[PDB]
Ligand SMILES: Nc1ncnc2c1ncn2[C@@H]1O[C@H](COP(=O)(O)OP(=O)(O)O)[C@@H](O)[C@H]1O
Ligand SMILES: Nc1ncnc2c1ncn2[C@@H]1O[C@H](COP(=O)(O)OP(=O)(O)O)[C@@H](O)[C@H]1O
């Protein structure tokens with residue numbers, strides 16, 4: 001691995017496609033190595049642009065626009081941070097010699113629920129929720145009938161609905177319809193699990209290494225708290241690691257992957273996988289020597305990971321207000337920080353409804369205690385408009 | 386404490402005066418809180434400018450120029466990172482309502498070796514090496530005669546330091562101190578040599594909730610640059626207590642909230658004060674791997690008026706500098722795959738050029754002992770192939 005000096009002729013250039021809070025930490029980790037960072041997004045002043053050398057606002061769904069920006073900056077690495085990108089163009093560009101992290105194929109497959117689900121359940125023979133695909137409401141209705149109630153419907157490309165009864169069918173389809181994949185959906189049976197985790201799995205030159213499992217709680221479409229290490233039996237852990245390694249090696253390329261799994265006793269079920277840092281992994285900003293962001297950069301730059309140290313019970317709790325403002329302020333911050341407690345405020349330019357504006361991070365002697373400390377801190381922040 | 390959102394109307398704005406690698410981490414820590422950062426220096430593309438919202442290049446020693454940039458950017462906080470700043474203008478700005486970190490007086494006293502030495506040894510009665518000031522070559526010779534050999538001479542306002550073992554060196558020592566001093570002419574300090582067992586940096590944070598201390602950081606200096614640093618450096622209970630007392634006294638005397646790098650010499654249980662940075666110190670870069678909150682995160686937490694609460698130390702750790710010698714404006718770093726790994730990381734600063742010996746990065750490592758951490762970091766730093 002050879003790195004230049006940012007802003008100098010031989011600089012190593014990283015282009016971030018998606019400049020949200022996760023990309024912000026990836027940018028910081030690149031900056032820490034003197035890597036030049038170009039942050040791209042569809043709106044100005046996105047979080048990662050604040051810490052990048054320069055930025056570009058473009059429609060990332062427009063392949064042509066994507067091509068121009070890439071051609072303009074000549075990046076050594078293209079690091080997609082969100083599903084909403086013209087992956088067909090990423091494939092093309094990769095074909096043309098560009099380095100897409102972890103690989104263009106991984107990006108394509110993971111952005112389409114069918115792609116990844118067929119890979120996992122069919123090709124790799126991994127355990128998953130039952131499922132069916134549908135491209136018509138009629139077909140959708142038959143699928144639901146085949147899966148049974150309750151079941152969840154999701155757009156393969158984006159609108160999700162937890163369907164309890166046939167009364168919702170009409171509305172379910174319709175919402176799926178409004179939420180990129182020509183209206184096709186997947187219909188899944190509901191897995192009853194004790195808890196869900198994100199197994200942050202780094203694929204690098206020295207192989208695949210795992211972070212301790214991160215438990216998380218989802219509510220209304222957003223993760224609320226995450227924690228590490230989630231208590232699991234050794235067998236369950238082994239099973240989760242085997243599933244994670246198989247998926248990551250099948251997707252290919254170096255990077256940090258967020259493997260989402262459901263745990264029922266000693267049984268582990270694969271759900272999905274992010275081919276990049278995952279939001280629930282923000283707990284790693286306080287819980288490990290190497291954050292998931294630093295791991296992603298280490299890996300994609302072709303450097304060895306070696307090991308990941310875990311600093312005991314830790315948690316993250318989101319700061320997720322709901323208001324409309326273009327000039328947000330945060331008061332009472334003195335009651336949200338202290339020993340074993342930190343906060344991040346993302347720099348988002350505006351809000352219009354629910355939006356994650358920051359996160360609280362805490363450590364403690366027990367997982368439950370860390371969760372409470374983080375939650376309490378997040379709740380002390382007064383978000384003003 | 387109220388924080389705005391960077392780039393929005395109610396943003397909280399911080400102006401860094403000096404944009405080196407220490408300022409770069411202060412900038413990153415402000416950015417992590419959505420604080421707007423304006424980085425200023427005497428040269429373009431300085432490390433902190435890479436991670437700042439906006440940057441400016443001016444003569445920081447020109448009070449008028451400093452006022453113009455402040456008037457243009459309207460920062461809430463002025464965070465000096467080097468000594469070469471118009472300190473009288475910092476005093477005026479503070480008088481006008483700007484928050485100078487930690488305070489303008491602290492900057493004035495520490496920018497001149499005489500100010501801080503007289504404050505510490507005379508006003509505060511803290512133990513220091515013997516010393517004499519001199520503003521002419523003949524006075525310099527008289528000072529040496531009284532201090533005795535060996536002694537060290539340094540410009541009061543900066544390089545230019547010499548370890549003098551005999552009269553033979555008098556002539557050159559004077560020359561160098563003059564060339565190395567502010568304006569290329571000025572007063573020097575002649576100090577008696579303290580034969581210490583080891584030296585440390587006691588990173589001391591003065592905040593709304595009191596004064597906190599990081600675990601002592603030991604360091605090794607060579608030819609004007611710190612080479613390795615480690616934490617914790619073992620100290621007797623009495624030595625630690627005395628070190629904390631000295632540090633507390635100096636930080637409270639200088640005033641204001643922030644992290645200060647208190648440099649001390651240790652002789653068994655006895656501790657001698659040497660100097661103090663009224664901001665993060667280079668030897669404290671080990672805290673980038675050794676603590677939950679680095680010295681940079683602590684400085685920001687403190688100056689923003691937030692409580693520190695406490696600082697977690699993760700076990701034995703060390704830093705080792707990457708200090709190449711070359712002339713280039715396009716430096717590259719190869720073999721990086723052999724400089725990072727388990728319990729081992731590096732930082733490359735993004736400095737635009739080099740023309741001689743200059744720190745371009747640092748290696749950081751953790752281990753079960755400082756001895757092993759130091760070796761791991763030194764080895765890693767040495768693996769980096771610097772070319773240009
Ligand atoms: N089949 C399923 N059974 C039970 N819960 C599920 C199932 N599929 C998804 N969920 C719940 O919905 C959440 C979000 O769905 P997911 O498939 O991860 O898509 P995304 O993370 O992109 O919204 C999961 O974290 C889990 O809490
Ligand atoms: N009086 C002294 N006795 C012994 N060593 C000294 C003395 N003064 C300085 N040194 C050595 O020189 C180093 C640099 O001096 P210092 O006063 O910290 O200046 P600066 O850090 O501004 O270069 C110290 O860290 C120590 O190694």
Ligand SMILES: [Cl-]
Pocket residue numbers: 208209210211
């Ligand atoms: Cl592992």
Ligand SMILES: [Cl-]
Pocket residue numbers: 345346347348357389390391418419
């Ligand atoms: Cl913000």
Ligand SMILES: [Cl-]
Pocket residue numbers: 442443444
């Ligand atoms: Cl100028």
Ligand SMILES: [Cl-]
Pocket residue numbers: 516517518
């Ligand atoms: Cl004197």
Ligand SMILES: [Mg+2]
Pocket residue numbers: 260272
């Ligand atoms: Mg998910």
Ligand SMILES: [Mg+2]
Pocket residue numbers: 648660
């Ligand atoms: Mg010093």
Ligand code: NA
Pocket residue numbers: 049050051052436437438439
């Ligand atoms: Na910026």
Ligand code: NA
Pocket residue numbers: 484485486487488489641642
């Ligand atoms: Na102040």
